[PDB]
Amino acid sequence: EQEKSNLNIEDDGKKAKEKEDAYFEDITKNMKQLKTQLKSEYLEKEKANIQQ
Amino acid sequence: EAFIQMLDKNLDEAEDQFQIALRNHLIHIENLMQLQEARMRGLAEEFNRD
Amino acid sequence: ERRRRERYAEIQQEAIASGKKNAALEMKWAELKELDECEELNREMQDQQQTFQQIIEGKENLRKEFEEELKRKDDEYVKMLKEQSNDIKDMISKMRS
Protein backbone atom coordinates (compact mmCIF):
# COMPACT_ATOMS: atom_id res chain seq x y z
CA GLU A 1 0.00 0.00 0.00
CA GLN A 2 2.72 2.47 0.99
CA GLU A 3 4.80 1.74 -2.11
CA LYS A 4 1.85 2.15 -4.47
CA SER A 5 0.51 5.29 -2.78
CA ASN A 6 3.92 6.97 -2.57
CA LEU A 7 4.67 6.15 -6.21
CA ASN A 8 1.25 7.45 -7.27
CA ILE A 9 1.74 10.69 -5.31
CA GLU A 10 5.19 11.27 -6.80
CA ASP A 11 3.88 10.52 -10.30
CA ASP A 12 1.17 13.11 -9.60
CA GLY A 13 3.93 15.54 -8.69
CA LYS A 14 5.96 14.73 -11.79
CA LYS A 15 2.99 15.07 -14.15
CA ALA A 16 2.18 18.39 -12.47
CA LYS A 17 5.81 19.35 -13.08
CA GLU A 18 5.51 18.48 -16.77
CA LYS A 19 2.24 20.40 -17.13
CA GLU A 20 3.64 23.47 -15.38
CA ASP A 21 6.83 23.29 -17.45
CA ALA A 22 4.86 23.21 -20.70
CA TYR A 23 2.64 26.07 -19.51
CA PHE A 24 5.55 28.30 -18.50
CA GLU A 25 7.50 27.50 -21.65
CA ASP A 26 4.48 28.41 -23.78
CA ILE A 27 4.18 31.73 -21.94
CA THR A 28 7.93 32.34 -22.33
CA LYS A 29 7.67 31.58 -26.05
CA ASN A 30 4.82 34.07 -26.38
CA MET A 31 6.78 36.75 -24.51
CA LYS A 32 9.99 36.18 -26.48
CA GLN A 33 8.16 36.04 -29.83
CA LEU A 34 6.46 39.34 -28.95
CA LYS A 35 9.80 40.83 -27.89
CA THR A 36 11.28 39.74 -31.22
CA GLN A 37 8.65 42.11 -32.61
CA LEU A 38 10.54 44.81 -30.65
CA LYS A 39 14.24 44.29 -31.52
CA SER A 40 14.39 42.53 -34.90
CA GLU A 41 11.09 43.98 -36.07
CA TYR A 42 12.44 47.29 -34.76
CA LEU A 43 15.34 47.27 -37.23
CA GLU A 44 13.09 45.99 -40.02
CA LYS A 45 10.66 48.85 -39.32
CA GLU A 46 13.55 51.35 -39.23
CA LYS A 47 14.55 50.11 -42.68
CA ALA A 48 10.93 50.52 -43.78
CA ASN A 49 10.82 54.06 -42.36
CA ILE A 50 14.03 55.13 -44.10
CA GLN A 51 12.96 53.60 -47.42
CA GLN A 52 9.53 55.24 -47.21
CA GLU B 1 -26.87 -11.77 27.51
CA ALA B 2 -23.49 -10.27 28.44
CA PHE B 3 -22.17 -11.55 25.10
CA ILE B 4 -25.00 -9.96 23.10
CA GLN B 5 -24.33 -6.75 25.00
CA MET B 6 -20.66 -7.37 24.17
CA LEU B 7 -21.80 -8.44 20.72
CA ASP B 8 -23.14 -4.85 20.73
CA LYS B 9 -20.28 -3.60 23.09
CA ASN B 10 -17.73 -5.32 21.01
CA LEU B 11 -19.95 -3.83 18.34
CA ASP B 12 -20.20 -0.62 20.40
CA GLU B 13 -16.42 -0.24 20.33
CA ALA B 14 -16.35 -1.18 16.65
CA GLU B 15 -19.00 1.42 15.88
CA ASP B 16 -17.05 3.98 17.89
CA GLN B 17 -13.96 3.40 15.79
CA PHE B 18 -15.98 3.44 12.57
CA GLN B 19 -17.28 6.83 13.71
CA ILE B 20 -13.66 7.78 14.49
CA ALA B 21 -12.58 6.70 11.01
CA LEU B 22 -15.42 8.67 9.42
CA ARG B 23 -14.45 11.76 11.44
CA ASN B 24 -10.84 11.33 10.32
CA HIS B 25 -11.95 10.92 6.69
CA LEU B 26 -14.10 14.04 6.89
CA ILE B 27 -11.17 15.93 8.43
CA HIS B 28 -8.87 14.74 5.64
CA ILE B 29 -11.39 15.75 2.97
CA GLU B 30 -11.72 19.11 4.75
CA ASN B 31 -7.95 19.65 4.55
CA LEU B 32 -7.98 18.61 0.88
CA MET B 33 -10.75 21.16 0.31
CA GLN B 34 -8.85 23.85 2.23
CA LEU B 35 -5.67 23.40 0.22
CA GLN B 36 -7.55 23.09 -3.08
CA GLU B 37 -9.16 26.40 -2.13
CA ALA B 38 -5.65 27.72 -1.52
CA ARG B 39 -4.55 26.61 -4.99
CA MET B 40 -7.63 28.04 -6.72
CA ARG B 41 -7.35 31.32 -4.80
CA GLY B 42 -3.69 31.59 -5.75
CA LEU B 43 -4.56 30.96 -9.39
CA ALA B 44 -7.27 33.63 -9.30
CA GLU B 45 -4.96 36.12 -7.57
CA GLU B 46 -2.11 35.60 -10.04
CA PHE B 47 -4.49 35.81 -13.00
CA ASN B 48 -6.10 39.03 -11.77
CA ARG B 49 -2.74 40.62 -10.92
CA ASP B 50 -1.66 39.80 -14.48
CA GLU C 1 -29.64 5.56 22.55
CA ARG C 2 -33.05 6.72 21.36
CA ARG C 3 -34.05 3.28 20.00
CA ARG C 4 -31.13 0.80 20.25
CA ARG C 5 -30.27 0.83 23.95
CA GLU C 6 -33.94 1.55 24.68
CA ARG C 7 -34.96 -1.70 22.98
CA TYR C 8 -32.06 -3.39 24.76
CA ALA C 9 -33.56 -2.27 28.07
CA GLU C 10 -37.02 -3.41 26.92
CA ILE C 11 -35.79 -6.90 26.05
CA GLN C 12 -33.66 -7.00 29.21
CA GLN C 13 -36.70 -6.30 31.39
CA GLU C 14 -38.88 -8.73 29.44
CA ALA C 15 -36.27 -11.49 29.76
CA ILE C 16 -35.86 -10.75 33.47
CA ALA C 17 -39.62 -11.13 33.91
CA SER C 18 -39.52 -14.36 31.90
CA GLY C 19 -36.74 -15.66 34.13
CA LYS C 20 -38.73 -14.72 37.23
CA LYS C 21 -41.78 -16.59 35.95
CA ASN C 22 -39.71 -19.62 34.91
CA ALA C 23 -38.01 -19.78 38.32
CA ALA C 24 -41.44 -19.49 39.94
CA LEU C 25 -42.68 -22.38 37.80
CA GLU C 26 -39.61 -24.48 38.65
CA MET C 27 -40.39 -23.92 42.33
CA LYS C 28 -43.97 -24.86 41.41
CA TRP C 29 -42.62 -28.19 40.15
CA ALA C 30 -40.45 -28.64 43.24
CA GLU C 31 -43.55 -28.12 45.40
CA LEU C 32 -46.41 -29.78 43.47
CA LYS C 33 -44.19 -32.81 42.85
CA GLU C 34 -46.13 -35.11 45.10
CA LEU C 35 -46.31 -36.76 41.67
CA ASP C 36 -43.37 -38.92 42.73
CA GLU C 37 -43.86 -41.06 39.62
CA CYS C 38 -40.27 -41.35 38.41
CA GLU C 39 -41.10 -42.21 34.79
CA GLU C 40 -43.42 -39.27 34.12
CA LEU C 41 -41.17 -36.96 36.15
CA ASN C 42 -38.20 -37.92 34.00
CA ARG C 43 -40.19 -37.60 30.77
CA GLU C 44 -41.38 -34.12 31.73
CA MET C 45 -37.90 -33.11 32.90
CA GLN C 46 -36.41 -33.99 29.51
CA ASP C 47 -39.38 -32.25 27.89
CA GLN C 48 -38.65 -29.04 29.79
CA GLN C 49 -34.94 -29.44 29.08
CA GLN C 50 -35.99 -29.34 25.44
CA THR C 51 -38.06 -26.29 26.38
CA PHE C 52 -34.95 -24.56 27.75
CA GLN C 53 -32.76 -25.44 24.78
CA GLN C 54 -35.43 -24.28 22.32
CA ILE C 55 -35.68 -21.00 24.25
CA ILE C 56 -31.89 -20.65 24.07
CA GLU C 57 -31.91 -21.51 20.36
CA GLY C 58 -33.32 -18.05 19.71
CA LYS C 59 -30.26 -16.64 21.46
CA GLU C 60 -27.94 -18.82 19.38
CA ASN C 61 -29.68 -17.66 16.20
CA LEU C 62 -29.45 -13.99 17.17
CA ARG C 63 -25.82 -14.34 18.29
CA LYS C 64 -24.86 -16.14 15.07
CA GLU C 65 -26.48 -13.48 12.91
CA PHE C 66 -24.71 -10.86 15.02
CA GLU C 67 -21.37 -12.68 14.71
CA GLU C 68 -21.96 -12.46 10.96
CA GLU C 69 -22.68 -8.77 11.67
CA LEU C 70 -19.54 -8.19 13.78
CA LYS C 71 -17.07 -9.94 11.49
CA ARG C 72 -18.95 -8.33 8.61
CA LYS C 73 -18.57 -4.98 10.39
CA ASP C 74 -14.81 -5.51 10.49
CA ASP C 75 -15.03 -6.38 6.78
CA GLU C 76 -17.09 -3.22 6.28
CA TYR C 77 -14.40 -1.20 8.07
CA VAL C 78 -11.76 -2.62 5.73
CA LYS C 79 -14.07 -1.86 2.80
CA MET C 80 -14.45 1.67 4.17
CA LEU C 81 -10.67 2.08 4.34
CA LYS C 82 -10.42 1.02 0.70
CA GLU C 83 -13.36 3.24 -0.26
CA GLN C 84 -11.86 6.30 1.45
CA SER C 85 -8.47 5.60 -0.13
CA ASN C 86 -10.05 5.47 -3.59
CA ASP C 87 -12.15 8.53 -2.69
CA ILE C 88 -9.08 10.62 -1.89
CA LYS C 89 -7.26 9.20 -4.93
CA ASP C 90 -10.00 10.32 -7.33
CA MET C 91 -10.45 13.59 -5.43
CA ILE C 92 -6.75 14.46 -5.71
CA SER C 93 -6.62 13.49 -9.39
CA LYS C 94 -9.69 15.57 -10.27
CA MET C 95 -8.64 18.53 -8.09
CA ARG C 96 -5.19 18.76 -9.68
CA SER C 97 -6.59 18.22 -13.18
Instruction: Determine the Cα–Cα distance for residues C77 and C88; give it in Å rounded to an integer.
Output: 16
From residue C54, how far is each of A44, C58, C61, C69 by CA, in Å?
A: 106, 7, 11, 23
CB-based contact C75:B15 (threshold 8 Å): no
Pick among B11, B17, B25 to test the C interface (most C CBs inside 10 A): B25
Q: How far is CA C87 from CA A19, A21, A34, B21, C23, in A?
A: 24, 28, 45, 14, 56
Find the CB nearest C95 among B5, B18, B32. Answer: B32
From C63, C81, C91, residue closest to B32, measured CB to CB: C91
Method: cryo-EM
Report the gap between the CA of C27 and the closest CA in chain B (Å).
23
> Per 3-state DSSP, what percentage of chain B is helix, strand, and coil (rounded to 5)?
90, 0, 10
Resolution, in Å, please? 7.4
Element (H, E) at C72: helix C38-96
Interchain CB contact of C73 with B (< 8 Å): yes
User: Residues B29, C88: contact at Cβ < 8 Å?
Assistant: yes
